[PDB]
Amino acid sequence: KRLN
Amino acid sequence: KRLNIVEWQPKSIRKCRIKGMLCLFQTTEDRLSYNFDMYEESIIPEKLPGGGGFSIKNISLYALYQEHIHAHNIFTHTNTDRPLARYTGCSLKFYQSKDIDYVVTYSTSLPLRSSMGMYNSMQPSIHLMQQNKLIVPSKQTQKRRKPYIKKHISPPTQMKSQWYFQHNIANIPLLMIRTTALTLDNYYIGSRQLSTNVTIHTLNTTYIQNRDWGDRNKTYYCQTLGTQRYFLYGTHSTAQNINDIKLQELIPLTNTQDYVQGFDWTEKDKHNITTYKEFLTKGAGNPFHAEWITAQNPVIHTANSPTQIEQIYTASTTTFQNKKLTDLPTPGYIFITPTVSLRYNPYKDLAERNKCYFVRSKINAHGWDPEQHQELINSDLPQWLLLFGYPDYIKRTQNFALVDTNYILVDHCPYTNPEKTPFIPLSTSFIEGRSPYSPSDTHEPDEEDQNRWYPCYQYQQESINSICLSGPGTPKIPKGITAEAKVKYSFNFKWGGDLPPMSTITNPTDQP
Amino acid sequence: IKNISLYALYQEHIHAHNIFTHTNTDRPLARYTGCSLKFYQSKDIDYVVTYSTSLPLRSSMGMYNSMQPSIHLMQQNKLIVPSKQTQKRRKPYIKKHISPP
Amino acid sequence: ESINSICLSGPGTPKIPKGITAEAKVKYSFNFKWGGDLPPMSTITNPTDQP
Amino acid sequence: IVEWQPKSIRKCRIKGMLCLFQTTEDRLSYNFDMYEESIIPEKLPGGGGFS
Amino acid sequence: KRLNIVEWQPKSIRKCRIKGMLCLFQTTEDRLSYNFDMYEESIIPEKLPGGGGFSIKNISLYALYQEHIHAHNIFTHTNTDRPLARYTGCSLKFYQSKDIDYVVTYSTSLPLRSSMGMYNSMQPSIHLMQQNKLIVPSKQTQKRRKPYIKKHISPPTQMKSQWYFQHNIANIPLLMIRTTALTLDNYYIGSRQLSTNVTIHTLNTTYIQNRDWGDRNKTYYCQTLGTQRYFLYGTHSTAQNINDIKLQELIPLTNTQDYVQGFDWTEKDKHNITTYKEFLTKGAGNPFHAEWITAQNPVIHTANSPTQIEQIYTASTTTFQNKKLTDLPTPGYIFITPTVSLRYNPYKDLAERNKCYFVRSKINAHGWDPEQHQELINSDLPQWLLLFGYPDYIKRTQNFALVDTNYILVDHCPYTNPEKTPFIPLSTSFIEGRSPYSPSDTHEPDEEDQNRWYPCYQYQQESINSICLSGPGTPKIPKGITAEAKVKYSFNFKWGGDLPPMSTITNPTDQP
């Protein structure tokens, strides 16, 4: 979904 | 080894939900195959209550600000003194329309571009087959617990969770919505009447090829073969034999730019005509007038130039009475119709040699071959899919001079029962002597269409819409009804900055 | 009476009436697993369906007479689809899975 | 050839017989991912296919 | 800092073989380029002993 | 709902492992780019100790029986009275060769066919890049614990575990093995000597185009332009100026089919010649003789036909002494060489307009354009990859008349430093007047190559092998050494049937  | 990238949060932060309503399309049946823009090419809304049956919308923070100038949205918090923005995503609520169903699909690939395959894939049956579609039935086709379908859309993958200056992200398109109008219950029949076959009108390709249109300063000639020029003449004569018609009966065509019928040499004394030169200028007929366009009154095609007829008249006016179509110079006098009507059946179409392109209407160039942009040629789809949104892809591409009067749409299709090598589709309104979207009670163009009364894309529009309406999924809309669709949006932002200034009001002079 | 074959499905793809979720251009083997049908309620008309998968395909005089709406409605393993007018439903379609021949 | 001969006087420089070419190679594997929205695709007739 | 992963992803290993040098004794002090100054490979079987 | 398919096992069953040894290739350096067949086109093994540096092997139970007739395998159990077979798979042991490395890959897709991309992908560098390769280093490049690599191969997916009649499965190919000869330690240099550039000989395309080869019954002419024919003449003259050479000095060419040099008119009295007609028949030179092929002694190109020279001689033999190349009919006397030498560099090749095809050598057709099979044209790969195995793909395709003498290989390549529009590669042996694979101490063709001494694929073979040897991964093999590779196979079968009959031997007359 979302990553650092 | 590797570290997370980290940002330091700004000193003051204010959440803002930009909330509002967006029109997806508003359409009549005669506009279903066209793209709806709410902000128009200024002729489109003149006597049309809906401009198009599909749209592609791009949404950006600047477009959201422009919708706030139209009062179409609210900003839950102002942004005046916080210059940073942090976009978090969108919520859409798609509402069931009363009378029409519709397919939506959306994208957030930050790279924004248009494609010929995208515009063809807007065809309602093709769009309804795509993955990650949303179908919204009308309230008539399905009653539901919730009258809307709601979904959340994440930012573009290129828009990271970081803060950005609002000046930088203002024009970045953060959402694309694609919508097309549909019927589920009339999917095959659509708006068909009587036979499955649709009738297409076209310009005879085998005689009308010179494309020298839209001047009163040029005697019109329909084709060149070898070194020759060929010419058309109207007559009201009851004569059964092409040989015995007089040199007088013929009404020569010296204009294409007007709706004017011309008149016969028997009206010489009504227009104070002294010579065949004044008969040519006052009395010549435009070949596209409502009786000459389909030869309701006979029309004669010949190699014999009007200037050879001028020489016969001017050499002696008394022998112009005596001379007939017999013993004339180059006398290829035949009976030819400028229009032919084809029958098209969509179920008989196999798309093996189908093709479609635009050619320049106002230029001095012969023939109909694909010319100019060869990358804009659209091929190998059935005509109801091949034509769908293709004119709007071409307009949005801007590789042609924009005005409908300066181009013609030309298409090849093996699958009409009669044939012409290319087809030059023409709308029933132009075949009946009426403005492009004018009601049938009218029997003349309006003044701006009385000018420029010659073959061009502006007069083709209803014919290619009618071919697209032969395709599956296309809706049935009663005449005088406009179908509409809307979404309610909520874009989620934060505004960031250092603390802003503020001001205050006197206590005594305040809400009493 | 409709007969469906993989070649008829390819012909419907030439009419743009279907999608293939994956192309077959360079994989010459096929392994058919069965079909799902969703039959939709029409707006104005009801209709009886029945289907078969006996690999032997043929037509008969008794088959064509048995298409008469009253006779077809009496047959076993019919499906009746009422119009939206004759019955409002939770799901606007009837769905069933059909095994290979 | 004279400045090559001066460099050959320096340490570590190899001895290669005349008419022999010495060579070295590496095998590489660069690791990438490609990203995008879903692409289009096309298909082949069943009757005219690998028989 | 966080990124949102793209809709479709496809791993690709670009695999191959690279020549590090090909040299004779009379070219040891020179840089090997495989794509040449067009005179260098004329009557030399190896262009350089380092790269 | 669904059931497993079940078979009833036959009354008697006998396991049989067909065990043996298969040659993968046996090659010299001058055969590396060609397919090894152990059972030959009968000319190939004549004075070649190894036929090819790659192979494609198909194995079937009938091919295993044919290898038993050569005594190359054993059957662990006979099949004489059990007609059913149940194939279970194969074990292969690939042995390290002493002197050469090699890549293997194998397939069991029951559908068996050949492809142009398959034969190009046999190139050692390309095959070494493929997935599911096996690399076998030589004993020199790597010492190993086990001197072989062993792997088990399952039946074709179409060959199920069921019993089959041996008559039905006999010809079904149950394994394909693809092998190519390689070097890992000489991967880039290969067998390069001196410069990276390789020299290619070719027929001048701008003068040699008529392709009317291999008759002593036809006066040869090299090109036609407009209505004209152009002709070649040899001379031993020391004359520096093309204008002053006599009509006598020229040695006209009336044959292409022979190795013969011809002779000068000064030898009239050695061959009892009475006329220029007898000089034409006895003394004419073939343009491809070892001195005329590269014009070691000068060669003259002209529009002036030998029959115009016949008319000058026969009209008066005394003025044939007086007449020079000045004031002759159509005198385009120039100095032209039938051969040019190009330089090719593989690292300078970008494959943007590379192309390759075969044209008919023994036909009366002008020019070099791609002709006949347009699907056999090979394009857009670097010449060392484009040529690799392409002649063998064409031979195995059988779409051309099979004999090397009846076709020429023609290729386009922008990347030679000098250029010719097509190239007609020719081997150094044909450029030096020697048989296709004959040792350089020889200075004449053998009798069967003294006949048919004209441009054809049989004389091109070593030149296209030399271009393939410029490509990476191609091995270095010393002259007079043949490199070889072998696999040991074990195919696993069962034989099935009803119980067979048997016979017995007397006890008294038996092993004493």
Author numbering:
A (entry chain Y): 48 to 51
B (entry chain V), F (entry chain T): 48 to 559
C (entry chain 0): 103 to 203
D (entry chain U): 509 to 559
E (entry chain U): 52 to 102
What text appears in the publication on this structure?
Our determination of the LY1 structure demonstrates that ORF1 encodes the capsid protein and that anelloviruses evolved a novel spike domain that extends around the 5-fold axis to form a crown structure. The particle, formed by 60 jelly roll domain-containing ANV capsid proteins, forms an icosahedral particle core from which spike domains extend to form a salient part of the particle surface.
We determined the cryo-EM structure of the virus-like particles formed by the insect cell-derived ΔARM fragment to 3.9 Å resolution from 6271 particles and of the mammalian cell-derived LY1 ΔC-Term ORF1 particle using cryo-EM to 2.69 Å resolution from 22,743 particles. Despite being generated in two different cell lines and the presence of the ARM region in the mammalian virus-like particle (which is not visible in the density, suggesting flexibility) the two protomer structures are very similar (1.179 Å root mean square deviation when aligned over residues 48–562). The portion of the C-terminus we can see extends from the jelly roll core toward the surface near the 2-fold axis between the spike domain crowns. The local resolution of P1 is only slightly lower than the jelly roll domain (~3–3.5 Å), while the resolution of P2 is within 4.5–5 Å.
